[PDB]
Each structure stands twice: as C-alpha cells, then as structure tokens.
Design a protein around this ligand. Structure first.
Ligand SMILES: CCCCCCCCCCCCC/C=C\[C@H](O)[C@H](N)CO
Ligand SMILES: CCCCCCCCCCCCC/C=C\[C@H](O)[C@H](N)CO
Ligand SMILES: [K+]
Ligand SMILES: [K+]
Lengths: 186, 236, 40, 265, 236, 265, 40
C-alpha cells in the first residue's frame, strides 16, 4: 500500500494534499470525493508506487485494493458509503445513482480502517496504461470511477473539532500483471 | 457478538455495534415447492441483478418526530432490475434482508423500536388516500403511533419481529423475513405483504452544545425471488 | 552450451518466476487471519 | 514458495453472519490489507494463465542504455567510469539499495569535421582501461599506450561496433546506490559526504592510432547489466537530478497536476 | 422437409413452405468457458424473459425497392427485458435465431437474398451519420446494393450465412447464429456484431389485376445470453 | 478430417432409373450443390497426386511486402505503425475478419542529394520504437534517444539490411480487419466510426546519429507475417481505396468488361 | 533446432494440409443426400 495525492487542488500544498476532509452536515446524502480508477492515468494516482511502476509499461490487468483510515477523536462517530461504477457514462450525480454499482458501507469504530476491492471487469484480457486521445484514441480503455457519500452524518460532543480527515491507500491484488516496457515520462 | 458483515451480489454492509440478527418465525427465505405451485409456465429467477442491497433516502430524527414507515414491495417498485422485473411480470414471490442505521455520540440518549408487520392496514380515517397507502421510496410519517395506525396498543407490537436501537448500547438493527401469504404467489402492484415501521419511544436528548442534526437510514435487499406471467410493463 | 571460460561471458538468465510477498506486505510478529478482526 | 502465473479465482456465494468479517482492517499495525475478491462480492471460476516474466529483475534490467558520449581533443579523451551523466539508467538502478551484476559494454565511433558534420572516412581507434594507481597517457603518442599489462581494445570505424563483457569487480559483496557516510576518517567536510570510493574502478582513455587532419572522433558507450541480484527496494526518485556525483535536489509544492475540485473526476 | 415449428420461452412460430434451417459455421449458440473468461464477477443469465421471439415493424416490397437492413443488437436495444438487461449492464454476450416471412400467390414472381454478415461497416460516404449506423427497430434502406454498401461485389455475399426466398418455391427463411468476436464479451451499446440484410435480386411481378401490396416481416430471438458489470442504466 | 492431396476419380457406368437423381438441386436452402463428376457422366480411374500446400495460409501470406517509404527532414522522421498506405498487402489481409500472427520487419536505407539523386556515402542510422504514452524525440539531438527502456536498432548504410521479429502484441485474442463500432462512449461523431484503438501499437522514429551536410536518408520498410491463424473469410475488395484509416469508396455501374451481346462468346 | 528464446524467432510452419469444407459449403440442420431430391 502507498498514499494517494487525492486533494490536488490549486490552493493546497505539501502534506495537506494527502488528506480528505469530513465535517458535520446540516443536510442529507452529500458527496465527499470522486476520482477515476485508471492507474497509469495522469492525476492523483501518478505519484504512488503502483502508479510509477505502471508508467514503466504499456498494458495492465487485475483487481485493485483501495483502503481508507479514519483520523477523528475517539468520541467522533459516522457512516459513509464508497462505490465503484463500471464504464458507460459520466460519474454518478447522486447517492441513489452511485449505490446501484459495487459498494461498501463503513461504520467508524474500534477497527480504524476498511477495504473496497475494485474487481477486474473488462471486455479484453488487458487494458492500455495511457488514456491519451489526440493520436491513438486510447480513451477507449477508460476503466470507471470511485465516489464517496455520507450514509448518516459525522456526530460530535460539545466543543469538539467539527472537521476530521481520512487517508487513502492503493495496492495491486495477487492477479495483477504488466506487459511491454517503455520509458517513464516523468 | 457486536461485529457483523452482510454480502449479497455486488454489495457489502458492515457494523461494529450490532445486537445479533433476527430471523422471523424461525424461517429463512426459500423456493416454491412442486406440490404447492399452481401457475404452469416456467418461472424467471434473475439472481444477483435483483438480490442485492438498495439504500432509500434518509429521515431526520427531529424534536417533533412521531415515527415513519415504508411498504414492501412498493418502496423498491421503481429501483434497478428488481423494479423492471416486477413491472414486466403479472406474479411475484420473495423474502427480504433489512438493515436500519442510526448513530450518535456517548453524550446522546434516545430509543427507537424497529418492527416488521405482516398485512398492516392504515385505518385512522374513513377513506385512506393512495399517497398514504403506497408512499413509494420516500415513505410516510406516523400520524397515530400510540394506536399503531390500526386500532391496537403500541405496547403489544412485540408479537411481530423487531429489534431496538438504544443509543447507549447499539447503532444498528437487522431483520431477515421469509415470504408470507395465503396463496403461493401474488401481484406486486396491487398487494403489499410487509410494512417496516420506525417509532421513537424515548425521545432524543443530549449534553448542551452537542450535534443536533441526526439522520436515520434504511437499506434493503430482495432475497430468493421468482416471477411468472410475462407481458408488457404495467404500474399503478 | 557455453563457448567461453568465465561466467561473465554467458547469456541472460531464463528463471523468470515470482514469490510470496509477505516479507514486504505483512512483516508482523503475531498472525492476523482474513476472517477475524485485527485488534482484539 | 515460487510461482510461474498469477492467482486463479473461485466461485463464491452470499454470506449473512457475525462470525466472519474480512472487510474490517487496522492500517496502524504496519501490515497491508488481506481482503480477497471472493470475500467481498459473489465471484465465478476463472482459470488465469497470465505469466510474470516481464517484471523479473532480468526482465526489467536486461537491455542496453547510454552511459557516455564525447569527442577527442588533440587526438585524445578520457572518461571516469560512473553511471551518473544520463538520467534514464541512473533512475532505474536507484530502485534498489544493493545489487550484484556483470556488464556488457558496446562502443560506437565515427569521424566529424570542425563544424560537427559527419565524414565518410574509416580510421583505427584504441580504448584503454586504466585502474586506480596506474599512470594514464598524457597525449596521442605517449608510451603508456604499449598496453602490455592494462587491457585494450583496438578497432576501426568501418567494422561493426566493439563489445566486451566484464564480471562483478567491487571489493564489497554488492554495489550500493545509497551510502549514508563519509569517505575517510578525520574529514567531515560537506564534499566528503555520500560518496562510496568502492564503486570507483578507474578511467577509459581513447585515441586515434594516427593523427587525423582537421577531423575528430565522436564516441558513444552503451551498458547492459546481466545476471542481476538485488536487495531492499527503495522509494522511486520524484524530483530532477542536478549533479553527476550527488543526490542534490530543489523542492516544489506538488507532484501531480491540479483540478478544479475534489468532487469532480 | 417443408413444415417447421420453432418454440422459445412463451413464443411459437410455424411455417408450411420452409427450405431446411441454416446453422452458421456449423455451430449452435453456447456458454463462455472458465479457461476463456476474464471478468471475475458472477454473471446474470435471465433465461426465458430475454430468450423469446420479438417481431419488428414491417417493410413494403414496392416497385422502387432496392433493399433494407437491421443491426444486432441495436434493433432490440429498447424492447422488453432483453432491452432493460442490456442498458443496466456494461458487458453482454449471446447468439440469435432469425425468421424472415414474405408470402404471395402462385400468380406472382420475384426473389430475395436474406444474408447475415459479421462486422459489416457502412462506407459509401466520407462520414456515416449515427442514423445510418444505428437505425433502431425500424431499420434503414440500402442506397448502394450492387457494392453491398461496403465496396465488395453483391454476387460474392454467399460466403456469409444466407437463404433465398423464391416466390415459386418458399415463403420463409431461417438462420441460427452463434456469438462471434475477437474477445470473450463486449459493450452492447458501442459495437454491433451482426447485420441482417434483405435484397431483391429478381424484381416483383404478377398477373394483371393481382394484389399489389406485399409486406416483408422480420422476427428475432436472443439465445444463450449472459451479462456482467451491473450499474445504473446507460444508452447512446 | 485432414487431407494432403486432392480427390481421386472412380469408374462409372450408365444408369436408367427413377430411384436416384443427383442432378436435381434446390439453391434456396443455402447449401452448395453435391453432384459428383461420376454421377453426371461415365468416368475412368485416375490416381490424382496434386498437393494443396501453395493455398495454405502460410503459403499465401508467408512472404515480405512494402509497408512504409519516407525521407528525413532536419535529420528526423516518424511513422505511425499501420498497414494502410500501400494497397497490395492491405487488400490481402482484408480477406479475413480475425487473425493472429508474428511479424518479421526488414529495413533498407540510403543517402540522397537535394535533387533526390543517390550518393555513395556510408552513415550510421538509429530506429526507436515508442509505445503509446511514451514521449517521442523532438529533433536529431533530443535526450529521449538514450533508449534505456524503449527498444532500438542501430546500423549503417553499408552493412546488409536490419531485421527483427515481433510476437502477437494485441490486448485482444486476435487482430480485426473489420470493426462495426465507435472508439469511445458518448462520441457518436462520424470520424469516431470503424476504428479499433486496440490495433494501434505506437510509432517508429528514425534519425542519423550525426548531422549530414546537404544530404538526407531515404528509408523503406517490408513486413512478413509468420505462424498465421485466421477466422471468418470475407468477400474480396472490388473498388479502389481512397484513405489510409477508413474503407471509404466511390460507386460505378459494372465490375467486368462489356461485350456486344449475351449470345456471342 | 531452435537457436533463440521466444517462439516469434522461429521459422515458418510446415503443416500445409486442407480439410473438409462442409462448415462453409453445407451448413444445414437436416442432411440432404446426393441421390435424393432436396425438398420433400
Ligand atoms: C575495455 C572495456 C572497458 C571495461 C571497463 C570496466 C570497468 C568496470 C565497471 C563496472 C561497473 C560499475 C558500476 C557500479 C556502480 C555505478 O557506477 C553507480 N552509479 C555508482 O554510484
Ligand atoms: C525496432 C523494430 C520495430 C517493431 C515495432 C513493432 C510494433 C508491433 C506491430 C505489430 C503489427 C500490427 C498489425 C495489426 C493490424 C494492422 O495494422 C491493420 N491494418 C490495422 O487496421
Ligand atoms: K494460475
Ligand atoms: K489423392
């Protein structure tokens, strides 16, 4: 496992780019984050161990392991839902649309962490690592999205910190493999 | 034990403050037998496309909260391939897995009864509306919780399958229901076999300044399903 | 067949297997089974 | 235990229980997750025959890459043997802490004018290897070019490229791509830090056997590792190199590209 | 023999002027093997709800008739529970049974070629429109029958599976097709595996005063179907 | 069942009967005729030893043909790997729907003046293979030419031609010479139709290792398939090609030459 | 004898036979013998 650079937005710099925010809500069913699952693609995954070795090769196959850890106080509670959406359109726009695909419900307690497995659902035996559309039309190989929503709410005692952080880990599963070595563009 | 994991089709649920699992009338869901069957055409059994968890929109436990309910299979009649199979066929049969979630700190107190009732009619009024009798996936409010909406004492609801969520002890409730009727199969659009009711019996209170906004969330799976009599799609 | 005297002369190895990764992935003193909870 | 293919997949049914909880984990312990696919969803049987050979050390490392490129000045030049000037092979070798390997070297040479325009002209060249403590030649005609003890290769710009193998030549039990220490006792100077003198094995020196008129040699060297062994994988390099003999770098506030918001893919 | 009866799910077809049945490349439709499979999730196999005859709207054999075509599975993408299963899933695989009907008296003469072609592209024009490439359940006209819409001779189409309807001999044609592709499964909404083409090679003529209005009718069944990768519903 | 020669012929006598009618047929059924020679005339014995080997897939496909021909501009050029520019090998591969094969590539290179007149001058050239997502060189002296991961071949215009084998490299279980579909989801544009991105495997890039004065390289590439397998024979192409990446064509009212009347041979 | 490691290196195949063409020439569900009439 290695950490994902998930909070990659303009005003966010250094170690702060590894944290996902949570906070106490005043309305229902809201969205926490989204990302494309494609491991060789430019974006949050590209700096990870799994990302750097995938950028040494042209083709990939196998299941992925995504794992999340909660870093609030002992007294903080909540539940969240994490979903994988296979290819065919845009990212799902609501919690009803997301929960029709592969998903988990996570309850924060003693065991700090949870795994979602993104299983290999593909037409062919392998996919391309780039998704670059200007020459080879390789957007053909796009692999789907992962998204996170509130199931209930984050709840705290009086005078506590009303904002908390999650950390996100990615790794390959034992059916994973790579073909055709090429020069790392970084 | 207090930990649990439920897995159906492409879906999984976890909890860390459970209180066992109830299996209604000591029976799990099961198939229709050759001695008990009547319709002669070959049934459809969709498998993992129908038999998986769906999550309904959430409800807030307000100051004024009297309670809320859902009808099965009405609530899931327009969701996914459970919905489409139910519209295209004349007859349906099947059981349910149900999981209710509500979390709050060690600085909160309150208690909910979570109860599944067979053949529950709404009858505080001369003529129930279609809105009150089939409220869809949003559900509807209890206006008469003490008489259980039906002219019986609330206190005697524990003859039906139930659990409690007591905020000092647990944060979730789990029920498994088999198919119940006086016939082997029935219309999905004209008759509701079960109702799921959630009623506060001790009101929500907390240490001054604690988080006030507390949702309740319902997640449901069809289980052991079969359909007969295919035609065009039809709805009420 | 090798034509030269010293082994640095020989061609590339053909033993291209992998092995169990637990020395890097799970290097812990006490075992934690898949179906159990980790901390007890 | 050793494997020649990736793992298969078995059939899996639904589960409703308190007794088995594979999705719950504790990252604090330092272990990577052990949830299998079959535990998390209902699966089908798949017999998977994909192989693992392109990602072996021989697979990843076993191909030639550029290490040196230079021209002669007054009929001579020399090169300190060290893989730091060209970053592509440098960035691959720093994925391991310690390695043992043999090397196959390939030499390609040609004649150019003073305007660096190539010339159709065949000439004899000589390459000499000079280990530390041996005297290097001063110019094109010095008497160290007798080469009676030092190894040489002699060849012509109109034959195919020159090539030789070399064995594992360190005084240590492996080469080192990281070294947290100083060169010698009583010299904590900042230029004495993070160099191992044990990887330094000497120079190559090149000449034309006879004087060219106006023209010069241009020369390129490619290196290929063989029979790799490797210990203790390192984090991969993520900032530009600056210097040939040190790991020095400049900081910056990100590694990947930015986006408009965390909720937009 | 010249009589036939085809039965699938709740549907049956009969004919009295058949000419045997073709089974393309000597293969019947079949399931995906464990050695050849790649997607790891458990597939959906709907059975009798998808695998049954559907009838498309009819076409008139006019004086000016040059020919007509259909794309599979495009033509059935919005019909019944075949349609709904194909929209809800990422991947699909399956074969087909096809039956073409056209009847006329002993006082009429004419001949149609009925041909199924794998991987057929439309390319008489620099840039085919979405209407011409995916014409739905109504199908679309042949504008270039002599070059078979693709830059080959019409005369050499008999390398693909086919029958003739010759009005002195028969009134129906029947083809059975297995799944063909370079991969084990594929997207139903982005790629069409087969095209069904109907082309007049001898024009329709009759004794003076005979019935002039003569329809052609196409009836199609999915066969041996499976789906993977469930999500929300998606269309082009 | 498998055969190494064509069919023999047996003796046949006269027949007068109601019971056996091999000349009558029904083309409506979709089957080709089964009347044998011996059924239709009186025949003699012939032992026929003609073989069938020149019409096997290895027989028909197993020989080299031209795929690319270009010159360098400012000491560089690149080529998208695709067999559409030269119609003879294109027209043969479109006789099958799906095929698997290995390829043997041969490279022939020479020096020309600015008037495209050949020059007696020997020079070093380099060819680099750049898969999709890798950075291609910008010019003759860019640092992507180190080639430490990407494969290269280096050679000289005065040696014999360069040659390498390549295995079956698609992500699919076969290549496809017809594809009735679109490149990606949510893009039904008419330029996105009938291309499979899965056959696209990248570029070749070519340079001279050093700058020529006034002259240029001219380069030709030949490809030969090996170990062919093939499925689902197609109707042969019968109109001119127009474009490299599409099957577009123009219509015309005949295929063979005309004659004065149907009764005159 | 093969001199190289990968099978793409090997020379052309020498198994140049033909086979029975009935999968393309007579792909029909019910058999129609030579001496009989086809439609009955
Ligand atoms: C006539 C042919 C010339 C052959 C000369 C051979 C000299 C031996 C070279 C062995 C290779 C040494 C590699 C060791 C370490 C690397 O240089 C590292 N980058 C040092 O930091
Ligand atoms: C240094 C030597 C260069 C070798 C580069 C090899 C790249 C792999 C090429 C494989 C051949 C692909 C053929 C596949 C399909 C055809 O291009 C079709 N005409 C596509 O429409
Ligand atoms: K295996
Ligand atoms: K013979």
């Amino acid at each position: 496992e290695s950490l994902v650079e998930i909070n990659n937005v303009s005003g966010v710099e250094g170690v702060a780019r590894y944290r996902i925010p949570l906070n106490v809500q005043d309305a229902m069913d809201g969205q926490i984050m989204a990302v494309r699952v494609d491991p060789g693609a430019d974006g949050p995954m590209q700096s990870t161990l799994l990302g750097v070795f995938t950028r040494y090769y042209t083709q990939w196959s196998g299941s992925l392991d995504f794992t999340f850890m909660f870093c609030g106080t002992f007294m903080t509670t909540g539940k969240v839902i994490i979903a994988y959406t296979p290819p065919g359109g845009d990212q799902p726009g609501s919690r009803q649309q997301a929960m029709l695909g592969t998903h988990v419900v996570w309850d924060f307690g003693l065991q700090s962490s949870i795994t979602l497995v993104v299983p290999w659902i593909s037409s062919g035996h392998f996919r391309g690592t780039s998704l670059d559309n200007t020459i080879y039309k390789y957007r053909y190989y796009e692999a789907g999205y992962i998204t996170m929503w509130y199931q209930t709410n984050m709840v705290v005692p009086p005078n506590f910190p009303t904002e908390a952080s999650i950390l996100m880990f990615v790794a390959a599963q034992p059916n994973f493999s790579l073909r055709i070595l090429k020069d790392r563009p970084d | 034990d207090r930990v649990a994991q439920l897995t159906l089709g492409n879906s999984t649920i976890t909890t860390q403050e459970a209180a066992n699992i109830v299996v209604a009338y000591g029976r799990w869901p099961s198939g229709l037998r050759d001695t008990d069957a009547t319709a002669v055409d070959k049934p459809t059994q969709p498998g993992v496309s129908a038999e998986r968890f769906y999550t309904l929109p959430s409800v807030q436990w307000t100051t004024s909260f009297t309670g809320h309910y859902w009808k099965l299979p009405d609530a899931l009649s327009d969701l996914g391939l459970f919905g489409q199979n139910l519209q295209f066929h004349y007859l349906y049969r099947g059981g349910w897995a149900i999981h209710v979630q509500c979390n709050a700190t060690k600085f909160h107190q309150g208690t909910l009864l979570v109860v599944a009732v067979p053949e529950h009619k709404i009858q505080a009024q001369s003529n129930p509306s279609f809105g009150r009798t089939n409220p869809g996936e949003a559900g509807a409010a209890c206006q008469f919780p003490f008489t259980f909406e039906d002219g019986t004492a609330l206190g005697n609801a524990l003859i039906y399958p139930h659990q409690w969520i007591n905020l000092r002890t647990n944060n979730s409730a789990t029920l498994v229901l088999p198919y119940v009727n006086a016939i082997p199969m029935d219309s999905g659009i004209k008759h509701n076999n079960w109702t799921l009711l959630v009623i506060p019996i001790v009101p929500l209170e907390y240490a001054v300044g604690a988080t006030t906004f507390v949702p309740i969330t319902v997640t449901i799976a069809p289980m052991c399903t079969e359909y007969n009599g295919l035609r065009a799609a039809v709805t009420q | 067949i090798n034509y030269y005297e010293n082994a640095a002369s020989n061609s590339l190895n053909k033993q291209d297997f992998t092995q169990d990764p637990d020395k890097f992935t799970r290097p812990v003193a006490d075992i934690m089974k898949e179906a159990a909870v980790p901390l007890k | 235990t050793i494997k020649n293919t990736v793992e298969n997949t078995v059939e899996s049914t639904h589960s409703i229980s308190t007794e088995a909880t594979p999705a719950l984990q504790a990252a604090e312990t330092g272990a990577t997750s052990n949830a299998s696919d079959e535990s998390m969803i209902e699966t089908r049987n798949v017999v998977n025959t994909h192989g693992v050979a392109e990602t072996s050390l021989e697979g990843f490392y076993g191909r030639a890459g550029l290490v040196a490129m230079f021209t002669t000045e007054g009929g001579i030049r020399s090169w300190y043997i060290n893989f730091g000037k060209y970053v592509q092979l440098r960035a691959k070798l720093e994925l391991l802490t310690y390695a043992r390997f043999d090397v196959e070297f390939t030499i390609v040479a040609q004649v150019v004018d003073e305007q660096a325009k190539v010339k159709d002209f065949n000439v004899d060249y000589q390459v000499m290897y000079v280990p530390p403590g041996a005297s290097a030649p001063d110019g094109q005609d010095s008497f160290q070019w007798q080469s009676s003890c030092n190894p040489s290769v002699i060849s012509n710009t109109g034959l195919p490229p020159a090539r030789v193998s070399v064995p594992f030549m360190s005084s240590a039990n492996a080469y080192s791509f990281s070294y947290d220490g100083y060169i010698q006792f009583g010299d904590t100077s900042s230029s004495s830090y993070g160099i191992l003198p044990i990887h330094y094995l000497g120079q190559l020196v090149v000449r034309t056997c006879e004087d060219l008129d106006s023209a010069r040699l241009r020369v390129r060297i490619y290196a290929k590792p063989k029979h790799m062994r490797g210990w203790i994988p390192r984090s991969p390099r993520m900032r530009p190199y600056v210097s040939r003999f040190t790991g020095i770098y400049t900081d910056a506030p990100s590694f990947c590209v930015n986006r408009e918001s965390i909720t937009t893919a």
